[PDB]
C-alpha cells in the first residue's frame, strides 16, 4: 500500500486501489492536471473490479457457496446424473 502513495488523480496513479464506497471520484478532482494520459482508463477499471471482489471479503458467511450452474461432469456420472441449480432461491443461510 505504501509508498506509492495514494490516488489523488493524477495519472500515475496506483493500480490497486483496495478501497470501497469511495466518494473520491466525485468528489473533487479538480480537474485532472497537465499529464499526457492514455491509460488511466483500464487501470482504474480492473482496479475497481478487483477492489469490489476484494470488497466482498465477507458476505461469504451468508453463502451457500457457488454451485454447478448446468448439468455437466462432475467426473463420475456413472452412479449419479448431474443436475445444476438455477439460483432463484435466497442465499442467506443465517
Amino acid at each position: 500500500s505504501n509508498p506509492t502513495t495514494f490516488s489523488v488523480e493524477a495519472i500515475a496513479a496506483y493500480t490497486p486501489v483496495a478501497l470501497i464506497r469511495l466518494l473520491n471520484a466525485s468528489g473533487p478532482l479538480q480537474p485532472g492536471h497537465r499529464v499526457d494520459i492514455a491509460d488511466a482508463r483500464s487501470i482504474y477499471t480492473v482496479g475497481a473490479a478487483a477492489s469490489a471482489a476484494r470488497a466482498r471479503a465477507n458476505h461469504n458467511a451468508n453463502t451457500i457457496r457457488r454451485t454447478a450452474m448446468f448439468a455437466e461432469t462432475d467426473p463420475m456420472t456413472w452412479l449419479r446424473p448431474t443436475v445444476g441449480l438455477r439460483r432463484t432461491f435466497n442465499p442467506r443461510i443465517i
Binding site: 480492473v46 432463484t88 435466497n90
Partner: protein
C-alpha cells in the same frame, strides 16, 4: 471504432445528395407510376430484376470515396417477391394475402398484443434493461448467473405499469421462457412470453407448410431454396454469438461467400475474454464468441456453435416479422459503448449486513441499498432508483459473478454471397448481394429526446443497417447532428455504404414501406409480412 466511420459517413452525406433518390418514391399510386412523366418507368422491365445506374469499372466493394466514372446501367436480383415496388404490388393485396395464409393458424390473444405494443410504445422505457441486455449479451452461463436479479427486475417492471420487459432481444425471450417459466414469474407474464414464442413457431410451421420437401440442390435444403427466413446465407440484423456465421460459412459452400469484419476479410472467433486482456480499443478482426458451458475453453479448441440451427430460423423470423410488425419502423439498431459502460457498472453500494441478521426487503429501512442514505451520486443505485425498481443486495452483487465474462466492443459485419443454385445463371452469378449486421449491438424501442437525467449519446450511438430498422429521430443521439442532417435524413433512410446499400441488399425499401404505412391489424400484418418473404426464384 464505428464512431469515426459514422461521423465520416454523415460528413460526406451532408453534401453527397443533390436530389431525392428514385428508389425512395414508393408513395406513388398506380396511375402515377404508369404515367409517362415517371423517370423510373423506363428501368422497370423484368419482374425479378431491379435496374439502376451504377459507376463504371468499379469492383464492389470499393473505397470510402466513390471514384468518378461514366454511369452505366447495372441490374440486380429481386430475391423477395415483395421487393416488387408498392405501386405494382399494393399494400391491400398483401394484407388480403396475409389474411389468406393466417386462416386457421395461431393468433395472439389481445392481452399480449396490448402489453407488447405498450412496451414498444414506451418512451419512458428504463435504460437499465438496455444496459443489462447489452452486458448479458445473450450468453447462457452469463444469463443464468443473474436469475434472481432478472426476476426481481421483471416483476418490478410488470407490477407497476403492466408492460412486458426484455422483449427486445431474442436471446432474452427464449432464455426467460425456458428458465423463468416454472412459476417464478407471475402467471400473466409467462403467458405473454409463451404466446409470443408460440406465434413465432406458428410462423415457422406456416413456412414449412407451403413448400414441398425432397428437392434439395447442391446441398441446399428445400426450405432455404423456397424461403428466406429458413435460408442460412441470410443472417440476423444483430448477432450475439458466432454460430450464425459458422452455419453461413458451412451451409453455402458453392455460392461464392465473402465477409468483411472491420477492415480485413475473415473473422477469428476468440472466446472467453476477461479482465486480464479485455483491451477495449481493439482494432483487429476478432469476434467474442462467449463462454461455452458444455466443456472447456482452451486455446486450440475450435469454436463450437452454441445452439441448434432452428434457433437461427426463429431469430430471423422474430427480427424480421414480429419486431417490424409491432414497432412500425420506429425502432433503430445500434451499437453500444462498452468502454463507457463497464466503469459505470462497477459502482454498487450494497452495505455490509451484520451476521446473524436478516436481509432487508422493503426500501424504507437504512440497510436497504435503494434507501436515501446509500443513493450516492454517480453510482448504479441512482440508475436503478431512476427506474423506480426494488432489488436486494445479492441481486446487485451477482454482477461480480457476471464480470468474469465480458464483451469488448461492437463492430459492423458485411457478408456477401452469390445468388443460390435456384437462380444460378452464368450472367446471374456476377450480381452479388450485400447485406450487413451488427455484432454485439442493440435496438431501443423508441427514442426519448427529453430525458435529461442521462446525457444523450453516453452509451448508445445510432448505426442503422436495415430499411426496416431505419430511424429518422434516433440520429440526434449521434454527436454533431444539425438541422440539415435531420431534414435530409427525414426523407431518405440513412444506411451507410460500409453496411450495404438498398439496391444490393436482400430486404429492400418496399418491405419497409409496407410495414410502416399499413394499418390493418397485428396478426394479419405478421402473416402478410411472412407471405412477403417468399422467393421469386423459379
Amino acid at each position: 471504432t464505428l464512431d469515426v466511420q459514422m461521423g465520416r459517413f454523415m460528413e460526406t452525406w451532408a453534401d453527397m445528395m443533390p436530389h431525392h433518390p428514385h428508389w425512395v418514391n414508393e408513395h406513388l399510386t398506380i396511375l402515377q407510376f404508369i404515367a409517362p412523366s415517371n423517370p423510373r418507368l423506363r428501368f422497370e422491365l423484368n419482374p425479378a430484376f431491379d435496374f439502376f445506374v451504377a459507376p463504371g469499372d468499379v469492383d464492389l466493394p470499393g473505397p470510402q470515396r466513390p471514384p468518378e466514372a461514366m454511369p452505366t446501367v447495372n441490374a440486380t436480383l429481386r430475391i423477395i417477391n415483395g421487393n416488387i415496388p408498392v405501386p405494382l404490388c399494393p399494400i391491400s393485396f398483401r394484407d388480403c394475402r396475409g389474411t389468406q395464409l393466417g386462416l386457421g393458424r395461431h393468433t395472439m390473444t389481445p392481452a399480449t398484443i396490448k402489453a407488447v405494443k405498450d412496451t414498444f410504445e414506451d418512451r419512458a422505457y428504463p435504460t437499465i434493461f438496455y444496459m443489462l441486455e447489452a452486458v448479458i449479451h445473450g450468453n447462457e452461463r452469463n444469463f443464468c448467473a443473474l436469475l434472481r436479479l432478472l426476476t426481481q427486475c421483471i416483476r418490478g417492471y410488470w407490477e407497476q405499469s403492466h408492460r412486458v420487459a426484455f422483449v427486445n432481444n431474442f436471446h432474452m425471450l427464449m432464455y426467460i421462457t425456458t428458465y423463468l417459466g416454472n412459476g417464478e414469474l407471475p402467471e400473466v407474464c409467462i403467458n405473454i412470453y409463451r404466446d409470443l414464442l408460440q406465434h413465432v413457431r406458428a410462423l415457422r410451421q406456416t413456412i414449412t407448410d407451403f413448400t414441398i420437401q425432397g428437392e434439395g440442390h447442391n446441398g441446399e435444403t428445400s426450405e432455404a431454396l423456397n424461403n428466406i427466413l429458413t435460408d442460412d446465407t441470410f443472417i440476423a440484423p444483430i448477432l450475439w454469438d458466432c454460430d450464425a456465421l459458422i452455419y453461413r460459412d458451412e451451409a453455402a459452400r458453392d455460392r461464392l461467400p465473402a465477409i468483411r469484419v472491420s477492415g480485413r476479410n475473415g473473422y477469428q472467433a476468440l472466446h472467453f475474454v476477461d479482465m486480464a486482456g479485455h483491451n477495449f480499443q481493439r482494432r483487429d478482426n476478432v469476434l467474442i464468441h462467449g463462454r461455452p458451458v458444455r466443456g472447456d475453453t482452451g486455446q486450440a479448441i475450435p469454436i463450437t456453435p452454441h445452439h441448434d440451427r432452428e434457433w437461427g430460423i426463429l431469430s430471423k423470423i422474430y427480427y424480421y416479422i414480429v419486431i417490424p410488425a409491432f414497432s412500425r419502423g420506429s425502432c433503430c439498431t445500434m451499437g453500444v459503448r462498452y468502454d463507457r459502460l463497464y466503469p459505470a457498472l462497477q459502482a454498487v453500494i450494497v452495505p455490509e449486513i451484520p451476521a446473524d441478521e436478516e436481509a432487508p426487503t422493503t426500501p424504507e429501512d437504512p440497510r436497504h441499498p435503494l434507501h436515501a442514505h446509500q443513493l450516492v451520486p454517480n453510482s448504479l443505485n441512482v440508475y436503478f432508483h431512476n427506474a423506480h425498481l426494488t432489488v436486494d443486495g445479492d441481486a446487485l452483487l451477482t454482477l461480480q459473478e457476471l464480470m468474469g465474462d465480458m464483451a469488448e466492443r461492437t463492430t459492423a459485419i458485411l457478408v456477401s454471397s452469390a445468388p443460390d443454385a435456384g437462380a444460378a445463371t452464368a450472367t446471374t452469378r456476377n450480381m452479388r448481394i450485400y447485406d450487413g449486421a451488427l455484432y454485439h449491438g442493440l435496438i431501443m424501442m423508441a427514442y426519448q429526446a427529453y430525458d435529461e437525467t442521462i446525457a444523450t449519446g453516453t452509451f448508445f450511438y445510432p448505426v442503422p443497417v436495415n430499411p426496416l430498422f431505419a430511424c429518422p429521430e434516433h440520429l440526434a443521439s449521434l454527436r454533431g447532428m444539425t438541422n440539415a442532417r435531420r431534414v435530409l435524413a427525414k426523407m431518405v433512410p440513412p444506411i451507410p455504404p460500409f453496411l450495404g446499400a438498398n439496391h444490393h441488399a436482400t430486404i429492400r425499401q418496399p418491405v419497409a414501406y409496407h410495414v410502416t404505412h399499413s394499418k390493418s391489424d397485428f396478426n394479419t400484418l405478421t402473416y402478410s409480412l411472412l407471405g412477403g418473404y417468399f422467393k421469386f426464384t423459379p
